[PDB]
Amino acid sequence: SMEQVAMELRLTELTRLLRSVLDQLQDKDPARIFAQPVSLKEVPDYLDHIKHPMDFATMRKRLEAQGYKNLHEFEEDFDLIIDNCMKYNARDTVFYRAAVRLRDQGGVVLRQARREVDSIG
Ligand code: NA
């Protein structure tokens, strides 16, 4: 149906916007602390601590399968990246501090992305 097609064109345009949002968010992580999943080989206890791991590569895989239906879903995953890190790592660490910075800087990007997703529909 043409209705189905038009919904698919909306999903695709959301996907394009979310890709640019994701690149912008990831530039706020020049150290690449959040680039890849935490390794269970190097933090073998990780999953006793953190129930839903997230990272930018996993977000990117989901994005390219057009797996985000809206901005809310994408933001939930970005938030898990931050929130996971701030629980596992202590306040005095380079990891926790990189999370705080990503959060603060990412908040600006997401503020306007929310207006672009509303605005362009
Ligand atoms: Na903690």
UniProtKB/Swiss-Prot annotation:
There is a cross-link at K41 (Glycyl lysine isopeptide (Lys-Gly) (interchain with G-Cter in SUMO2)). Disulfide bonds: none annotated. It comes from the Eukaryota. Transmembrane segments: none annotated. It is found in: Nucleus; Chromosome. Highly expressed in testis. Residues 9-113 form the Bromo domain. Scaffold subunit of various histone acetyltransferase (HAT) complexes, such as the MOZ/MORF and HBO1 complexes, that acts as a regulator of hematopoiesis. Plays a key role in HBO1 complex by directing KAT7/HBO1 specificity towards histone H3 'Lys-14' acetylation (H3K14ac), thereby promoting erythroid differentiation. Component of some HBO1 complex composed of KAT7/HBO1, MEAF6, ING4 and BRD1/BRPF2. Component of the MOZ/MORF complex composed at least of ING5, KAT6A, KAT6B, MEAF6 and one of BRPF1, BRD1/BRPF2 and BRPF3. Interacts (via PHD-type zinc finger domain) with unmodified histone H3. Interacts (via PWWP domain) with dimethylated and trimethylated 'Lys-79' on histone H3. This is Bromodomain-containing protein 1. The chain holds residues 555 to 674 of 1058 of the full protein.
